Each structure stands twice: as structure tokens, then as C-alpha cells.
């Protein structure tokens, strides 16, 4: 319908997440600026990547272990993926850390897929995670100012000017 049907958050999220998955899966630390996403996209990208790569390393056995179990081979693996997301949000608690983990796990999956040259499942997975992650609690994204709130909450005592 009107403006209430438009989702500018979706545009930014799709942009940031798909890019994040592609740069992470290829090991490309040099990703094109979030100009088409938003000013806060850059801060979100650097923060999301640092936390994502960090939680994976801090929990190598847990993250790599769970990753080995959820090996993508067909479209049927997408259904279980959403269930894993729903499993985390099962209590109804919408927090940024839970969003970063869901994206970090997805990033690890993309990294794993790229390693076996399964790009055909990476693109759909990135978009699926984005839509499912954003649509499940889009009302929360709006309340938290989207990625702007993500960088604000994840980086409270930030210097900003340096």
C-alpha cells in the first residue's frame, strides 16, 4: 500500500548482509563502502565482522562443530536453517547479540560453502537469512533504528571521532 508497506531497512539489511557473507566467504577484508546501504552500514559492517569472526574463533569447536553437522547439500537444508533461527528466537527475546550470531553462523556456512565452491547455495542462504532475520522482528528493527541502533548498542562507549 502506502509508505507503511515500504521497507528501507530491508534494502539496507540485504545490502549489508549479502555483502558481508560474500566478503567473509571469500576472505575479502576489503568490501565496497556501505554508500548504497547507509552511513551506519560501515560501522555495522566492521562491528558485525569483528564480533562474528571473534565468536567463531572464541568458540572454534562449538561453531566449527555445529557447522560440520549442518552441511548444505540441497534446498532442503534451507528449511532446517530457518528452524535453527527460530530455535534461537524461541523465547521471543529480540537482542542484537542473537542477530550477530545468526548472521555469523550464516557467514560460517557461506565460508564453508565457498570452500567447496557451493556459491549456488550461498546467495539464496544470504537472502533467506536476511528476510527471515529481519521479517521475524522487523518491528524491533524499527524501534532500534536498524543498524544505527546495532552499532549504538554494540558500541556504547565508542570514541567516534577517532
Amino acid at each position: 500500500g502506502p509508505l507503511g508497506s515500504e521497507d528501507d531497512l530491508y534494502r539496507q539489511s540485504l545490502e549489508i548482509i549479502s555483502r558481508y557473507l560474500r566478503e567473509q566467504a571469500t576472505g575479502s577484508k576489503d568490501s565496497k563502502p556501505l554508500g548504497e546501504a547507509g552511513a551506519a552500514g560501515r560501522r555495522a559492517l566492521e562491528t558485525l565482522r569483528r564480533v562474528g569472526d571473534g565468536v567463531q574463533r572464541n568458540h572454534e569447536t562449538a561453531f566449527q562443530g555445529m557447522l560440520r553437522k549442518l552441511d548444505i547439500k540441497n534446498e532442503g537444508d534451507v528449511k532446517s536453517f530457518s528452524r535453527v533461527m527460530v530455535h534461537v528466537f524461541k523465547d521471543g527475546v529480540t537482542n542484537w547479540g542473537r542477530i550477530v550470531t545468526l548472521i555469523s553462523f550464516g557467514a560460517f556456512v557461506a565460508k564453508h560453502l565457498k570452500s567447496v565452491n557451493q556459491e549456488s547455495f550461498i546467495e539464496p542462504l544470504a537472502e533467506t537469512i536476511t528476510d527471515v532475520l529481519v521479517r521475524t522482528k522487523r518491528d524491533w528493527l524499527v524501534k532500534q533504528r536498524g543498524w544505527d541502533g546495532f552499532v549504538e548498542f554494540f558500541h556504547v562507549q565508542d570514541l567516534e571521532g577517532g
Partner: peptide, 27 residues
């Protein structure tokens, strides 16, 4: 059947919950 998914979802939960709690309460 579901056990594997339960632990996987719970693991990401355990990690995520403590992670966000760090900023949630302590600022």
C-alpha cells in the same frame, strides 16, 4: 530428529545471550 537442532539453536543462544548481556546491563 530434533535434538541436534535443539543443541545447535541453544548453542547460538548461549553464546548470543551472554554476548548481548555484556552491553545490555554494563555500559
Amino acid at each position: 530428529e530434533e535434538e541436534w537442532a535443539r543443541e545447535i539453536g541453544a548453542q547460538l543462544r548461549r553464546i548470543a545471550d551472554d554476548l548481548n548481556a555484556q552491553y545490555e546491563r554494563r555500559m
